[model samples]
Target: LVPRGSHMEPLVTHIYTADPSAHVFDGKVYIYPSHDIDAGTPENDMGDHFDMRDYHVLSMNSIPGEVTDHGVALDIKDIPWAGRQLWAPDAASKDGKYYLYFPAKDKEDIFRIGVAVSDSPAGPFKPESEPIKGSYSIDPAVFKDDDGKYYMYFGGIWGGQLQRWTTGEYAGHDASKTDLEQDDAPAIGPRIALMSDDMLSFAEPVKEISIVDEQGNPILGGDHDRRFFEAAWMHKYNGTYYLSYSTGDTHYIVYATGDNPYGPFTYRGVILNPVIGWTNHHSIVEFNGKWYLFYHDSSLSGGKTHLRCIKVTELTHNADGTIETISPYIE
Candidate 1:
């Protein structure tokens, strides 16, 4: 994977950032991304030990170039209950206020989604004292439908986990009182819930969204459930909702489509296959009328899986709305 015409060269790698969530605010493409660091301790474990500490909301003076680091948007220490890691976060604006939605760990290994507020899009966001209760898991993405109603879609693994830290280790725990292995909990898959207008809380009934076979049957497990892993994202175009996610185990990004936000989603196939890293997480958006896939890779992370670097490539679509597999432009 040479840096040809437009390969995955880091947008800016001076300070590590992974699991980027791109958003459109006012007239700029605002990137609310997780800050990455070296997880050196044995207790941090190996796989998925993303010891992120803060969120940086970056933007451009112009479109598609000249990134402006808006400085620390929010830091974990500020969120009294923000235990440690600040995972993939997304921002949304409502009634002229900017809100950053993120998942962080609290005392006793509990992980919850917390909301931070700021007057400006790129903010010195102030976090609420508590995370939105009844919320769980890693990535927290919020989408506002055209009707002005808000929907918050999140969850990872088979579905939800009480504490990301089991036995003081993160992920990869076989059977131990001294170490944590993989989460062996029942799989609930991805879920969606309507958000209150303030976007501070769920209205209720967190509904599970399914990835169905061509026959419209929900994919369940034993061998495999064909469900979404982590890094859930939502976007719409011309009345069709594109529900995209990182398909775990495969290390690629895939999608499903539905006519509505809450959907009977039909599996469409891979939007992107494995790239230059171990884990795959992404966000898709059409900025300034051109579509782009914003994701991360380990190319510059010294090949370390957890210390991922951000990358972007232009993306396209078929006439029927199916997305073409993203590729590094060779021009």
Candidate 2:
């Protein structure tokens, strides 16, 4: 389909899309987003209603140009071990090969991160027989550093199942009642690992990401507005690593800064305020010389949380290297 709306508008209205993971591949902007569909699942804090089962690779030659929805890149039915619900996905290209990293519930109904490989960026990707060994939860964001190293940032709480992995194993829903018991304790962290050079598996054991305050203390679990909820993204700007994520229930996209990919990142400020929906997921990328924020909200479908639209707006960075806040409204 051709492009529909301008900046901050849905790239395409024909299909509901969410959890945009945008990247610059071969001088063109390619977006790997969850293809949201109304699967008749009820809305719950567990996010059962987001029953996306396939991926459509969206791309544009330029920001103000035609947008192409490159059919179904990969489908749940094509995955051998997948049960249902293909959530968020991210892509990376290395040595003429493209890798699509995604989350899906396996045969036993547990979330596992999997990688699909293709020779082309717009893919008819082939999935591995199993998920990456020792992987769990959702939102797989793979960051390729300047030194040709790749690291994956993943895991989410509540319906995404980060809480169930507290014991470094699947603890099951009955074992964990709430996101956290003590408000004063450090909030749960997103998991991270260095990826193997082939970009298909993890090179090391997964480690919890550390988000702290200016004084270097962990952000408390009760700090709902600021803690990491889901949708973890990492971008490098001026030699500093910026880790941005959504504050799930609070509905804000926030970021933190650190010097390392596996960081004790210091919390920054909001990248976007609450949009016209229950959830928000985003990605930051640079094309040409301009930076842009690609995110999703329910405005296109009149506040239907499960039917979201992918939108983009120019992202500005101040002289001090801080990002300016973006509101999802034109007015």
Candidate 3:
């Protein structure tokens, strides 16, 4: 078992839940996570409903130990589309503008992606538009590739497969939306698609990726199954693309590797296994010549909510482009 480093304690604990979105900027690591006071039961079970009223971005200067407290990046109700829950935030900066993309339920209480822009890393940000208005979309992750192209991947059980922006301000959509023909089985799944240069639209059709089942098997189960892949993240290192995502109700952080960004990714290995009663939703970033995994865990409050932080350590890769789980370190 990997032992917790001295700085591995909860960076922000007892704040309800967190979804970690981390990036390195101006020699510092900034973490943007969903900060809410809702402590209700998990959404899967028929339990108490939690309200995502207050969303904030917290920053730390260094990985784990040197982390400094930078205050709220955004809140849900402040957004133009703010009426319901605001969850799952991903942030990026390009040219001189910083963008925070998140999922928000509309006035009708439907999930959609929304964007907020700020001049600085920590911000008093303002909304660009009403939630990227759409139907059946959620969990938006924006990625800017080396070639300066942007892509957004989102969706879950309600939509059978992943959908991408194909054309007309959202083109090149994922073809997987039409790939599945199973009428009896629900089509709820995550969609992956490449975005155009404009960063507001897709370049092709959305594609549906396979989800791992409870037993670690790749099956085409929709929202009913526990092993669906949701939250997909891509990192390019040394000419190889690594896709890390949550699996089996976020019991662990698993990854696959491919030569292309959109890939027939070969399952590598698990980076983290369930520990301290915490599941994981994470992003990986490299800083100061070291690779760190930024993930959230349920360990602090007995698996009730999420407290997110960046854990530093070296990631080992196998010859087949797979990763071996390493005991995570805090500082």
Candidate 4:
């Protein structure tokens, strides 16, 4: 329980996780985080104090940390239509089943997008009474394509209400005028779709991807260090298509490539840089052959921003594919 970074540490220094979502399945490395609590509820910027209600599934068969806390796999009172702040979560496996994918806040508070079933990806999960007929905001990040198709990359915008969904519905958080006050418009990106072969729901209408600008255009919401302000990950290497995210308030973790998985992607630059506190969710996996990068920061409880702490760091990729920017204090 010591690591405050030396090579990306904090796999489990006892609870308080945040947006991880790293998956390798069978060989281990399960991780589906965002259980950070302390819920005193009073830090603004729209995160509404994070307030997470439950979810804790971290595993590890190999990595620079030996984590393993598979308790309480889903709770928000077991989510019968959550009414709290579960925040970021993601996990998926087909046929033999095990899908988790969350984003709570629906008792009129808005933010929808839920689905919990489990046959064990290390879980006690079993939710799904509703919420996912066009999920609204917050982070979801499920991406499992290799021809297997399972997209679902999710949303987030200040406090993650995602500009209250513009007019497509949900309009809360004070409604109307807010996508960062229109910097030229367009910057609200993160919401893919296509799942539904029992991976819970949505096999169509959700599309937004498009984070361009290498000459491709559209990344304009003032381009705060490269738009898309939330954590929506999707990985794939040799075949291209890597759409990493989180520039939320310009904290940096940027990425964008494109070949498919619904994207106009292209930004491509920083894989990570600032890390110590205040929101920067991440995930990009590739176990055995190496290529990690499951993130979260707050340096143990020292910075105490919402008590986050899950880390990992071995992600390189440069034969021209770009990536190679890490820095979670290892300097």
Question: In TM-score terms, which candidate is top?
Answer: 2
* Model 4 bad stretches (over 4 Å): 1-20, 23-30, 33-54, 63-69, 78-87, 90-102, 112-136, 140-187, 190-210, 219-254, 257-282, 285-289, 293-316, 319-331
TM-score, candidate number 3: 0.76
TM-score of 1: 0.87
What lDDT is reached at residue 310 by model 1? Answer: 79
lDDT of 2 by residue, 130-240 (tens): 999989999999999999999999988888989888878888757554576678999999999999988878999899999998889999999999999999999989899
Error of 1 at 138 (Å): 1.6
lDDT of candidate 4 over 1-331, digit per residue (tens): 3324246667677787988888988888888888888878788787778898888897877776457787988889868777888888888998887888898888888888888888989988888899888778878888888888888888888777777785678776577434757888878888888988888789788887778889888889987899888887889888999998888777998898998988789897899987888788889899889888889898888988799888877789987799888877765
Worst 10 residues of 4 by lDDT: 1-10
Candidate 1: which stretches are off by over 4 Å?
Answer: 1-6, 43-48, 158-187, 222-226, 327-331
What is the total number of backbone clashes in candidate 4?
1
Candidate 1 per-residue lDDT, tens place, 175-286, comes to 3322113334323456688888787899986777766767777655431324567788999877899888886666778888999988878888787778666678899988
Model 2 RMSD in Å is 1.1
| Clash numbers, per candidate | 9, 0, 32, 1
Tell how far residue 201 is off in model 4, in angstroms: 31
TM-score of each predicted structure versus truth: 0.87, 0.98, 0.76, 0.34
- Per-residue error at 109 for model 3, in Å? 2.1
Name the regions of candidate 3 deviating beyond 4 angstroms. Answer: 1-7, 14-17, 39-50, 133-136, 158-189, 196-198, 201-205, 210-218, 222-227, 305-314, 318-320, 327-331
Question: What lDDT is reached at residue 146 by model 3?
Answer: 87
Q: Is candidate 1 or candidate 3 better by TM-score?
A: 1
